[model samples]
Target chain A: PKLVLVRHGQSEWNEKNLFTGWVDVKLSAKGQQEAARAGELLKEKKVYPDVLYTSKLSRAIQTANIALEKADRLWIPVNRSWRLNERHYGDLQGKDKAETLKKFGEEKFNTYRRSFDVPPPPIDASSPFSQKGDERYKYVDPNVLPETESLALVIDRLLPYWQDVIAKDLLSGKTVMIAAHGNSLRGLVKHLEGISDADIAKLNIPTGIPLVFELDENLKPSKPSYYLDPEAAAAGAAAV
Target chain B: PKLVLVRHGQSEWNEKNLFTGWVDVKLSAKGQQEAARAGELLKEKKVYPDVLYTSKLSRAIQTANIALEKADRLWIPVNRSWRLNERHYGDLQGKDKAETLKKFGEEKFNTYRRSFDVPPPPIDASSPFSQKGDERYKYVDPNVLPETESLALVIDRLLPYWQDVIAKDLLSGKTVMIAAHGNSLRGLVKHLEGISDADIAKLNIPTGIPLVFELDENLKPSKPSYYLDPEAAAAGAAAV
Candidate 1:
């Protein structure tokens, strides 16, 4: 199976340094350009996707739309799921990222960031950011709720969905593209490439780059995957 | 209410001079230009549609899309229905009009042209031109079938939908635009103007012009209806 993963391009919130988990926002102008570029790259590579999977968020959906339009594959069937959403930020949602880090300090920030691998504490239902009773959360494990998630915790939740939903398509030899968010994709990469939980922190996917992975009959990676724009990927990784 | 009625621009079949009733052909390049012109006329007249109504056929759908984009109203809510589809032409469909005229002569051509006010024979269910049991036919009255329809028959079929569906918007003082076919728009004009059946025969609407109707507080016509492009209207009648 051939797997193509795309991180949603920079959104208005991302440029503003805001925590945008589950908050639907449009791609910024530069982000749209980046998405178009990614689409052009896919076209140049002649990597045609048969089906599309995207997070329910508008940013990811828009990324898929722009890319598919540029690829001349806008008519492809889309399967949207919340499982591909960025890791839920819990209480940190809507807060400025730099301010949060400044207030929390490096040690506390790393501790909070590391807590993502472990599921954050369950959210308080009465909080505004709480997903209590939302239909999208119906299939989500109750144990995975409310608190922010570490990369490992994201993997724990996302791998099941991948195995159950995406793996079958791969097994059928269909080319699939998953347009999703940052941490969720990180989780997927960790599982697919056998990256250790500690080592996974070093890998960060850049926005709007199509990372292409070719898998064997066992659904294991055949070799090292490559981003469409290696230079941009390297620059984005350094920033992350 | 400021009601704007627009007949779908020329279709592939329209260009070929074929009877395309209920056929889902797309707009031709000229038709696309007409649609853009309609949007420009609307913008020039400062008459904006808050909502839109179109037939399920691709010609009308594409016409609406182009016009809406030009009018900068692409995001508006759209209501599509089979009731808005062109009157089915039955077995006469796909035949060239000029050739039919040459074979049938003037008298027969006039009879066929006047057949617009009369109902043609019921369509054979097995015929490729027939739309029996189609999902879109669900909203249509099972008892009422038009293999072909005269202007009067079209008015009868079209008025109820206008009253039940479109009247609500007009009553609320919202501008309503009905994107449809030649006969259907004639039916609407016939009803709006209270044109006698004899005089209605002379009424000809050109393709792709936005016809404006200003209604009074009681939702009755307050002024004489006029085409945005008077020259185009004359040209259309001459072409017919």
Candidate 2:
């Protein structure tokens, strides 16, 4: 069975360099085109997906929609989970990333970046980003209500979903596609490829490209995974 | 609070003159335009939806997406339900309406049309439309399966959702919008307006027009409902 992961296309905030955590945003025009290109690559490889999992966020959902349409799998049933959501940036949400860096200084910025494995402080209960009383948070664990989380923390939550939900499908020889975000995908890659925490810090997934993995009976990687477009892949990784 | 109901825009089957039941289909290009026009009406009336409900089908989902994008209300929470799905046409699905009429003749056609109050037999238990054993049906009642639902049957199913779900939202002062199908919307209107089963056959809601209903404290409509586009409403009703 093959595991396929595609990061959501460029969001409007991604283009504007803003901190967008739980704030739902749509893909920019270029992001839409990138999603189409990714779909084309999947078509070229004949890697049709049997099931799709996506974040409830609009950008991820839209990316799945565009890519699945291109793959002629528009009617596929989609399972959505908040665990696939991008790491929440808390008060940083909607703030300009560069400006925040300038204001907080390189030391604080880098420290914050390295704290990807650590969970940030809880958001204010009254804040818009706070999910304290939101019915949508019912499925989530109340103890995990951090305003932000490190990539490692994301992996802790994401891996459970993968084990409980996605693994069975892959073991059954179904091609499963996860349309998610950069951090969430990275968290999965870190777990799947056995990358060290330090080494995983440097890895970044490109937006909208389908990354495919073939697994043996043990569900371990059989070969080094490859991106559909090598040149675009390099450019995307460098940009991230 | 005002309740807005908009039937989904034209679908691929609508263009092909086929009967589309629970088979998920998408909106045509023209249908997209109609959805945007509905958004324009919402903007013109200064009435924005705080919450939205739509069927699980793609056409209705796409209609909500397009209209919300136009109305700049994409951030609103969306509640999707199979109860809001278009009336399942049973064995008559995929058959062309005109062709069916020609084959059955006027007498048969009127009998079938008048039987709008009678639901078609339950879908075969083993058919693809049957919800049995599907995990997606976990939240859905297996016994509630409808092979084909007459408008009356639709009213029976839809009213429960409206009374338990939508009416609660309206009573809480939330502006609610329901994006659904022709028959489902008809059922809702029939319940809201207390239209007799016989008289409901004459009510034809124009696709993509937001029909606003202002409810009194008692949850009954305060005034005559108005369509966003009077001319389009007239033309749509006259055509039928």
Candidate 3:
């Protein structure tokens, strides 16, 4: 089975270099172009997805929408879940990255940014940036909804979905596509490639590039996963 | 159960006054605006759909994409099928409507356009407009795929889907939304409203306006379905 992963493009919040988390901002114009390019790459590679999965966030959804439109596959079935959302930025939600670094100092900022298990302080439920009681999560149990998340926590939440839902699609022999956030996708990549927690921190998935994984019967990669545009992907990953 | 019906906005072909059928042309600028406004209207009315259905054509898919984005319900699941496609225009697929009228005469044109049981000449498999061997319909049985269709024929193909798939969704207590072609929607409307064959010819579904139906347990309308924007729908229907 073929599994395609695409991290969402530059969002408005991304352009502003703010902690977006699950704040629901839209894609920037550059992000839209990148998404379209991702679609063109999919076409060029002759990889058509039979099913699509996306995060509930607007940026990821917009990325899938624009890319599918360009790929001439807008009619494909789609599913969205918050399980695929970006790691919650906690109290850092909506904070400027540089300003946060200045305030929290380099050590704390790096820990908060790259730590595997340690989460920043949870955002107050009543905070304006918090997704507490959001309507999109109405179907979700409030107990499971995160006010803050770590890469570890993201893996804990995401793995259930990947195992129960996405694995079923792959096992059914359909080409599956996921359009999601960086941290969420990184967690999946770590699981797929068996990367150590420390080593995973150094890995970056480029935005708006389709990473193709051909999986064996066990859902492990048959060979190494490759990006559609390897040269651009290398440069983009390094920049990230 | 609630069912929301939205005819696709004008396409590039529609703007050109050409027969589009299943040629997969995109929305024009105004058509995109209309689709966005349809989304806003859905938001304003608080008619959030739990699931979406669209034709295998781009214009209809684009309408749902824009409308769902505006309604802030882009995360909803979606399904598309050729059964929801526009009435295939056949040999007339790319012909200018006025030129066709001039060639075929008003009586013949009206009969071809509005007749309940008569379809235009079947498009040649070799014609560029023909959907023969189209990859999008690869899943469909070739025996059922149409080269030309009457409104009655559309109902024959579409009813099975409504009964087997859509009705099940309604029965499961979902708010269903369908974005499709004018004639395909009109056929559904005729079936739901029990319009006579002759009367169905006079009925026109306004493009880009959501028509809401509240259905009883049996999937029959509890009352007459209504457009979200009644005033605009009225004028638009008149123009159609």
Candidate 4:
């Protein structure tokens, strides 16, 4: 099976260094350019995805749409799921990252980010950042909506999707492309590679780089996944 | 039931005065502006769409996406279908409108444009414009894909969609919005208003205007449908 996982490009909140989970922000200008670059990379590699999976948020959908448009493959089938959405940051959703760091201090802030099992405080149900009453989530059980999430929670939510939905496609030997969020892709990579809970904190997925995984009969990566643009990938990961 | 139907903004071929059917062209710069304007009108009117329906064509999808973004309603559930596509021009798919008019003479061109039952010559399956094997339509039955279609053919295909997918939303009391093409919208309006076959030819839908229909139990319009910008709609329809 051949699979590509791409994090959504820099969003408006990314530029401002604000915590953005399911707030559904648009991409920044540079993010749009990065998304186009991701498409060109896929085209250059002659790898056309048979189907696409994206998060319900518009940023991921925009990235997938722009990339497919650039690759001249806008006609591919698409599926969007709330399970593939970004990790809910809860009360921190609209908070500035810098201010968050200042308020909590560097140690807690770093721990907050890398915390695998330690979910943050639940957002007020009435908060503007809350996903309650959002039309897209109507089909989703209210129990499934995240008030706050740890990386582990993201994996727990996404693993069922990986097994039932994405695995079905991969088993068909069709090239599968997923345009999703940083923490979401990290969860997927963790599951695919058997990364330990502590080890996952060390991994940083760069936005807009196509990470290709060639899986064996077991759907396990036969070799280490590689990014199309390794240099930018390294820099982007380092920045993250 | 509240229904809103919008014709896509001007496409590249629309500017060139070409006979664009299922060629799947992008919108022109002005068309993009028109789409954004449509969103603004929706916002000003305080009407929000619960769901969106679009043609398989990019121009229609682009128009819907842009307008939804402008209205901050990008997360609405989306449905796309070939039944909502523009009238397939068949052999005249890429032909220039004025040249076709001159070549076919006024009567033939008028018949091609206005005759409810007069479809142009069938397009060759091998033609560059043919959608055979297009990835988006792989799920559709090959026989369902049109080579040539009169406005009557378009209505025949669209009515089922109106009854099945669209009517379900309307019956549930959700405001459903459809972003589609010129002839397709004409076909729908004709069906909704029960215009005669011959009189249907006189219906010229203006691009980018929101045509709202408040339907009764029989699904007939509750009153005469109103365009959000009636003056420009009149001017645009006149140009058409």
Q: What does candidate 4's lDDT look like per residue over B50-116, in tens digits?
A: 9888888998888887888778777676888899999998999989888998899999988988899
Cα shift from native, residue A75, model 4 (Å): 3.2
Off by over 4 Å in 4: A235-239, B235-239
Of candidates 4 and 1, the better by TM-score? 4
User: What are the per-residue Cα lDDT tens digits for candidate 2 across A1-240?
Assistant: 898899877889889898777777788999999888888989988888888888767788778767876776654556778888888766667778789789889777765555555544445767775556554465567877557777777888788889988888888877899999988898898888999988877887878789999988888899988887777785435235
**lDDT values for all models:** 0.75, 0.78, 0.90, 0.87
Q: Is model 4 an incorrect, acceptable, medium or high docking prediction?
A: acceptable
Model 3: CA > 4 A from native: A234-240, B234-240
TM-scores for candidates 1 onward, in order: 0.56, 0.73, 0.92, 0.93
How does residue A149 of candidate 2 score in lDDT?
A: 76
Q: Which ranges in model 1 have alpha carbons more than 4 Å from their true place?
A: A1-240, B120-122, B138-142, B231-238
Off by over 4 Å in 2: A1-4, A16-25, A37-57, A68-83, A88-178, A212-238, B40-51, B75-79, B90-92, B110-115, B118-149, B163-175, B216-219, B228-232, B235-239
Recovered native contacts, candidate 2 = 0.03
Better candidate number, 1 or 4, judged by lDDT? 4
Of the candidates shown, which would achieve the greatest DockQ relative to the real structure? 3
How do the candidates rank by TM-score, highest first?
A: 4, 3, 2, 1
Write one digit per residue (lDDT tens) for candidate 2, span B16-117. 887788776788888889888998889888888988888877787777767876676654666777788778777667677898789889877665555656
DockQ of 2: 0.14
Instruction: Summarize candidate 1's per-residue lDDT along A13-96 as a digit string, tens digits.
Output: 988888777666677888888788878988988888977888767677767767875776543446777778788777777778
lDDT (tens digit, per residue) of candidate 3 on B95-212: 9999999999999999888899999999999998889898778887888888899999999999999999999999999999999988899999999999999999989888888999
TM-score of chain A of 1: 0.90
TM-score of structure candidate 2: 0.73
